[PDB]
């Protein structure tokens, strides 16, 4: 049983999403829930959140 | 039955500024092992966060 340390990858990715200033509250919460459910996709999900954050810049 | 309490505790613990990543990892690992302690672990994380201001 390989343990990918996916929970620690969740905390690193979740911290990065919380610091994205242009996402709104439900957007951030949606990414966090997706990270928690499938932490194997932590890097893909952070990449999507950064794309969305950059697209919503003032 | 704790999907709201878990998601809330997870989201608030991520925001706590005074925690280190290892402490933050420990709470996440306990939440994944027993989500029924979401309120207790969140209260513990905030208390720990207040003591490390």
Numbering used by the authors:
A (entry chain B): 0 to 57
B (entry chain A): 4 to 56
Paper text:
We adopted the Z domain of staphylococcal protein A and its affibody binder dimer complex as a model system. We next generated libraries at the interface of a weakly associating dimer (Z+ ZSPA-1) with micromolar affinity to determine if we could affinity-mature the interface by coevolution. To clarify these inter-residue co-variations discovered from the sequence data, we determined crystal structures of 10 coevolved pairs that spanned a range of cross-reactivities and orthogonalities (5 from LL1 and 5 from LL2). From the structures, we could verify clear compensatory changes between the residues showing the most significant covariations (13A-9B / 17A-31B) in both LL1 and LL2 library mutants.
The three orthogonal mutants, LL2.c17 (VFLV/IVVY), LL2.c7 (LVLF/FIVK) and LL2.c22 (IVFF/FILV), were selected to compare differences in their affinity and structures. Each Z-A mutant binds to its binding partner with nanomolar affinity (3.98 to 44.2 nM) but has minimal cross-reactivity with other monomers. The backbone structures of the three mutants are relatively similar (Cα r.m.s.d. of Z-A after aligning Z-B ranges from 0.447 Å to 0.641 Å). The other two mutants, LL2.c7 and c22, have clustered pi-pi and pi-cation interactions at the interface (Phe31A, Lys35A, Phe9B, and Trp35B). Additionally, the same compensatory mutations (positions 17A and 31B) as LL1 mutants are also seen from LL2.c7 and c22 mutants. All mutants except for one (LL2.c1) had a higher fraction of nonpolar BSA than the original dimer (58%), and all mutants except for one (LL2.c7) had a higher packing score (PackStat) than the original dimer (PackStat of Z/ZSPA-1 = 0.640). For example, A-LILFK has more Z-B binding partners (B=77) than A-LIFFK (B=15) from the LL1 library, and A-LVLF (B=53) and A-VFLV (B=42) are also more cross-reactive than A-IVFF (B=3) from LL2 library sequence data.
